[PDB]
Design a protein around this ligand. Sequence first.
Ligand SMILES: [Zn+2]
Lengths: 11, 726
Amino acid sequence: KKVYPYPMEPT
Amino acid sequence: NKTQEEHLKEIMKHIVKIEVKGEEAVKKEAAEKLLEKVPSDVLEMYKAIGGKIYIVDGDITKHISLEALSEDKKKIKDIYGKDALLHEHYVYAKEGYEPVLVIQSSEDYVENTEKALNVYYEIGKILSRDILSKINQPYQKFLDVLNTIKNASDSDGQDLLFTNQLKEHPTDFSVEFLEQNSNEVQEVFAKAFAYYIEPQHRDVLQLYAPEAFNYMDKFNEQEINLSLEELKDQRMLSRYEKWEKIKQHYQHWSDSLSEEGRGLLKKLQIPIEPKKDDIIHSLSQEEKELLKRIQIDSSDFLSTEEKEFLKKLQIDILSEKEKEFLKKLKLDIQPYDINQRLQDTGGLIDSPSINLDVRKQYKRDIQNIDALLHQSIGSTLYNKIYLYENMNINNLTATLGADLVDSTDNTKINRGIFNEFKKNFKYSISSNYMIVDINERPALDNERLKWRIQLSPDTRAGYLENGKLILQRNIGLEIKDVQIIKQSEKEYIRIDAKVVPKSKIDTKIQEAQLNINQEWNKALGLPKYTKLITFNVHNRYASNIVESAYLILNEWKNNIQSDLIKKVTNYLVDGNGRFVFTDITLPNIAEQYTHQDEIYEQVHSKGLYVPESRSILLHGPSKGVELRNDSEGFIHCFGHAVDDYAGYLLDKNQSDLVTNSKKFIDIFKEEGSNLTSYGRTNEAEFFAEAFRLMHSTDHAERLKVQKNAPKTFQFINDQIKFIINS
Ligand SMILES: [Zn+2]
């Protein structure tokens, strides 16, 4: 089952 | 007709010293009628710095305080710049750690509007050289007024206030200028204050220099009270006197606090890090062996900080199942931070984004602290009360926070990002507990935002020994001013705000939502009353999350085929989709969580598309894998929507992604590494990334897909027509 991310940039 | 005049008299009873020969009935009456023109608060501020006003007879240079001036301090320049001889003039303000103001005498300050001006001019001098200089003003705010005048239509305004020194200056007036020409800027401020104070010359100032007149008007009508407040903040006694009354007011409250009471407030200030010992203990041989063979670093959904702790677990003692493992440890290796939980959920503590046990544990502590903070600040020992808080801009907008500081001079703030950040900041919300200072205090290196909050008698708070207050959650805040200020040879953003009923701010957001749908439902041909766009706003940069939705959608409209939109966003609306613009973290929006199987199958990021709900979620505060703005993020996520509708039209018996097709998987087999590294992740991510660049606002980014992703630019385009025509 899935979804479509778009991560940020932490450190 | 009330207290205003009372302090006028008191203040004047102190600083004003009349020493004349003629019956001091009229004399003492003169100065009264003369200084009543001046804003009350500048009179008390002179007091504040230890200033005295002297109404003398004869040659003013013949008074005690002045006889100690050199040769030069005797030759001045009137408001007009015409040299003079002190022992001939009628006014003078001595500078120095012991300031004084000497005014001759006459009942014609009524008539000689030119002399009354000079006096006011001098007072003005006091205000910008003696008073404001102590709190680092005038600053950028006033530099702006100054520049608006030089580089403007009519050259009169300059003629009336600027001098050749300023007049002939090549460029604008930068902070560096004001710094090594303070005398100059201070003078201008004085003349403006003068013309504004003297009721006759006021018109000349509003006629030939309105920017200036407006500035002085707003300043002497309100913003001056905040100046006094600032002054007071630098005095040890003022600071301690204020702290004391507060301490007193909450005296009973504190003495009654239990041990648990202090316990709760204490953790609520320092989070409990997870102890390696427990972590290991709850593992399995299965999971613990994987833990060694696992290249923890090889994962890319773990932050370096988290990844760090995760490594230390190996020293102390991938694929599907393997990564499924690391999705749980992520939830487990998180600090127990109560304030973080309230911010992440924006107050929705029942959000099933974490393990049931820990959730309960968070609810109890919160319900409890909610009862501890039951006494409001409202007291008989004081009226307006300003509290202070130092913030890190990344907390409001990581994208802007990224460029807020001048890359070269750490002490300077980039004016570009400033106006952008200042843009739509009209209101704020606080969902966790705001910890503030009774008196302002220096901030951390990564904190360039300095808030100055006007509390409400109604606001509940807890008193802390160290001189801080812990405020109640769910606070409503209205921004009243935002300017660039200098403090400790470094530049910060002062944010003057006022506490108001959270309901009031929420209603604004509610109406805003109604409006934004009554508008786009039209522009798309959707039934007048559909729930398409949804604001899930709970944190400190609220208003911006709202005003940004509008601008994001506009760009999504001006870069994509209207017929491609309608077709797709109709599919969405059919499965009850939503365009969610929020400041809480994604793993806390129903549109995502109500569909997950496991809580550890949650995702947080700039944007995210959810098939099962057919909704696009966009998290405001963050900054996605280098994507200069919210716009691009929405659009990339729309690509997923399109990849959804596309593949759907294939064999409706089972909606599948067109990006799954045998054909496309091949386009990715060779082109997938031509665009962005992020698009290189997989099909659907390559499709949305490519889709995005194609419809970029920068054509440059468009040709980039055409001359590097041929078969793709073609594939994406087919689909579009496929959809449109179907
Ligand atoms: Zn994506």
